[PDB]
Write a protein that binds this DNA or RNA. Sequence first.
DNA 1: GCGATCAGC
DNA 2: ACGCTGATCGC
Length: 579
Amino acid sequence: KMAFTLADRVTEEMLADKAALVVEVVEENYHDAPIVGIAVVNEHGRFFLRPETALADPQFVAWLGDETKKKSMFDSKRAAVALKWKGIELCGVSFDLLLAAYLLDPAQGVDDVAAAAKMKQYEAVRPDEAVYGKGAKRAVPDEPVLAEHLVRKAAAIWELERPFLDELRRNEQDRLLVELEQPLSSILAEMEFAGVKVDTKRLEQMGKELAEQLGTVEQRIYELAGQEFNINSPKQLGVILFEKLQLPVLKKTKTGYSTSADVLEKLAPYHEIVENILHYRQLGKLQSTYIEGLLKVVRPATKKVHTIFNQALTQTGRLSSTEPNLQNIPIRLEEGRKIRQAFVPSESDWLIFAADYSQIELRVLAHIAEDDNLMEAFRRDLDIHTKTAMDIFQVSEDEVTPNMRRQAKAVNYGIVYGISDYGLAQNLNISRKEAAEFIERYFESFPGVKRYMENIVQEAKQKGYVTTLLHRRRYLPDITSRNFNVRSFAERMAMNTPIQGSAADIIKKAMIDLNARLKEERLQAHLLLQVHDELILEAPKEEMERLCRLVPEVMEQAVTLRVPLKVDYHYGSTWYDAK
DNA sequence: GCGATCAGC
DNA sequence: ACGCTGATCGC
Ligand SMILES: Nc1nc(=O)c2ncn([C@H]3C[C@H](N)[C@@H](COP(=O)(O)OP(=O)(O)OP(=O)(O)O)O3)c2[nH]1
Ligand SMILES: [Ca+2]
């Protein structure tokens, strides 16, 4: 139906200085994945190229790497990384339809060209699922079917760039796309392709020692329960605890008794088996997710793991990290924190450098709410979690433990994000009147925060959405829902999204600024990971002293707020030691 | 596949 | 009955 040239060779008219480009990678994980076809649409026509002809053509490779030849794409990071695995550099991406649709409305869940095209009543293209299938039936179709699908995707991108840019302009988001998300996409592509080196011998020895400790705790549980059972079975466990041992039923799920960690903590005074259960799960969590699961995805020839940072997924603008998730490696408990000893620099005599913001979301809140007391607190560089811990667990600053501060952090962030007296009472194991009066005291000390809570909800009802500092957007249609519970969830999103999202905006700009400074200084230091408010790098030891001065300054100066931004930093021979 | 659960931010 | 995620597991 749609006309195009099924090209046997690369011609000069395929290499214009503006074009829609499709470099199709069907496998969900695009690391070291096959490129199944290429399509180009420009002023001269529409073209399909087999990858073996295009990617071995010296003129096509040069065109791909020429920053002055502008390309419009969908999910350009997927193409850039897959091309890096083919030894080919992609430059000149000036428009990414995936990131443009994400900024316009993250709730659409746009994951292919067809979904983005439907936002502008363009339907001359099929969904990728319709072409490739699902599950064990997923397959690359016959070449004429594949070629037309890629051509139609490129033609869609070619037609949709201007209407998408027009609406982004109206939303004050065109700079958010062109100067933040698209430059970040190339940085993430470099981070993903570089990967993180894994000490595979240390990890396997940890796995062997962990299997022995799992057996000891497992036998102890059976000894305490009288019999043997599947401890990981939600049914069988609830039978032992709440039917055989007759422990109180504090909480139910849609499927039966709840055995979540908070419930098990409250059942500790009744039977010592529940503390062994918690220890068992924590060991099994490390074994299944952070030892076995990590070894599954290590590339054996390089001992590197290559995560994928999903840049167009979260509703607040944060990133997510998949296969493996390198944003939830344990750190709170020492037994789990040792996992980070297996994350090592990719070269000898290099080191891991870690730098994280201190209380960025509360500092963002102070700036946005213009709360006099909260701004004064951060202008003094007060540790507000520690101050809250002093005020919760009635001690002084020298007596605050890591656990008390860990718990005070959830109260500081819980309160500002609409925790109820019920939720606060359940978290601190205190009476509900006491939690209600603590929340009341909090908002009397910070009345500007309370005003912002009320104002941002009214702003959301009037405009239909909320925004971040760099004009990210999230629509909240449920904010005017007649169902109280549905409306309450939307109101807490209006409270939280501008703050979490602004913190995501700030660290994203910090990564762009940092990347530019690193190249300016001609340093070998490069980014490895982002963990929401935290940047992880590796570099030669000869660069550590310069990095200690460069990285915190870049992160602290990414934006200028009414309060200072504060960055802590550490380095060491492993990720574990970088703290 | 989903809901529970738990690791992080 | 604070927010945002992803992986694993048993059902
Ligand atoms: N609703 C909500 N509940 C939370 O329990 C919670 N936890 C962390 N976050 C957000 C706010 C932090 N600003 C940001 C960095 O998460 P982070 O752990 O580093 O918090 P913070 O910097 O203050 O403590 P720190 O000084 O030891 O570094 O992630 C949360 N939001
Ligand atoms: Ca932090």
